[PDB]
Ligand binder design. Structure first.
Ligand SMILES: CN[C@@H]1[C@@H](O)[C@@H](O[C@@H]2[C@@H](O)[C@H](O[C@H]3O[C@H](CO)[C@@H](O)[C@H](O)[C@H]3N)[C@@H](N)C[C@H]2N)OC[C@]1(C)O
Ligand SMILES: Nc1ncnc2c1ncn2[C@@H]1O[C@H](CSCC[C@H](N)C(=O)O)[C@@H](O)[C@H]1O
Ligand SMILES: [Mg+2]
Length: 311
């Protein structure tokens, strides 16, 4: 029921979308919301006051793109607006798992934290695997010559395209497909906010896809990464007695065979039923001495006390 709305940025001229994006820049994320900020907060709004804020040509762009729905008396939006790290972003509202459509898009559960963890370097060509709303691609666009975002959710591809247009970003491309199959060539930068959490090995849905999605990602990383490239992954990791995640990870990447260096920064951990362990952390592949290192970095705790310990 949440996450199935039609999103059609192709039905709106890019100049009209850029203007809606500039209007969002003024009001989204600011106290004392205007009608447009009310609309993109999930509050029904009077179409006339909307029109006075975005014009008569913005109101129809809201409708043609799917950003807004005509209820007759009011306008309402299935999407919610954010402004962070120099971009405006629409995504689905944060709702419980039981009311999520199969094409529900990550409502930015961790995006703001992950952007602060990301290395601040730029480079030639970046890949956003599982791009969702497109948020990570939009931020990378400001320091990469081109960015490709990939998602198997076609609604996320459409939302990403819409968010790119709202921001007037022209060096970002999005493609529908399964993992690396639409990503041709090599990349200097690969980011993956992985759909893994509490499901262990089980595929539950596109947002909890099981460890096999990590195995496919890491097995194919070495042939997609430019030499000297950087990979950054948000992931949940399961250690089992006699079978720690890090050993499987070393096998998937071919650490020695491909000459790669990996660092795992573990932020949260808990004992599990098997006598093993669940962990959430941040994994970086970056040039340096071959092998694997794991360190404790409670960045969730630090984020909650002060978002400023970037890196
Ligand atoms: C893309 N990666 C992500 C990953 O970051 C990570 O996100 C979780 C996120 O699910 C958790 O939301 C959960 O609680 C919310 C509020 O109570 C509910 O409203 C959500 O419905 C519910 N799911 C969040 N509390 C803590 C995040 N760390 O697991 C999923 C992922 C899709 O795989
Ligand atoms: N086989 C697959 N290939 C490509 N993308 C996949 C996939 N399985 C799941 N995904 C996508 O992985 C994404 C994880 S959600 C992360 C969204 C975004 N990067 C953000 O940080 O908010 C989802 O959009 C999901 O549809
Ligand atoms: Mg789910």
């Amino acid at each position: 029921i949440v996450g199935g709305s039609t999103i059609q940025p192709e039905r709106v001229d890019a100049a009209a979308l850029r203007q809606l994006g500039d209007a969002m820049r003024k009001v989204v994320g600011s106290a004392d919301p205007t009608p447009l900020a009310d609309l993109l907060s999930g509050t029904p709004v009077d179409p006339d006051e909307l029109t006075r804020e975005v014009g008569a040509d913005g109101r129809q762009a809201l409708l043609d793109s799917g950003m807004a729905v005509d209820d007759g008396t009011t306008f309402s939006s299935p999407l919610r607006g954010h402004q962070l790290h120099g971009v405006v972003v629409l995504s689905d509202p944060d709702v419980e798992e039981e009311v999520q459509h199969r094409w529900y898009v990550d409502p930015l559960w961790e995006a703001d934290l992950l952007i602060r963890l990301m290395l601040r370097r730029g480079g030639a060509r970046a890949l956003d695997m599982g791009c969702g709303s497109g948020v990570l691609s939009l931020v990378l666009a400001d320091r990469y010559e081109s960015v490709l975002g990939v998602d198997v959710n076609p609604r996320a591809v459409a939302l990403s395209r819409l968010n790119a247009a709202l921001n007037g970003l022209t060096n970002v491309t999005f493609r529908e497909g399964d993992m690396f199959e639409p990503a041709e060539g090599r990349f200097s930068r690969i980011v993956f906010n992985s759909p893994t959490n509490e499901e262990g090995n089980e595929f539950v849905d596109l947002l909890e896809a099981g460890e096999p999605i990590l195995e496919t990602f890491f097995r194919n990383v070495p042939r997609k990464l430019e030499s000297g490239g950087i990979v950054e992954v948000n992931l949940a990791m399961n250690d089992y007695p006699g079978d720690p995640f890090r050993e499987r990870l070393a096998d998937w990447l071919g650490l020695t065979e491909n000459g790669l260096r990996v660092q795992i920064f573990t932020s949260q951990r808990r004992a599990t039923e098997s006598g093993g362990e669940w962990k959430r952390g941040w994994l970086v592949v970056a040039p340096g001495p071959v092998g694997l290192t794991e360190v404790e970095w409670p960045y969730h705790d630090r984020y909650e006390e002060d978002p400023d310990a970037l890196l």
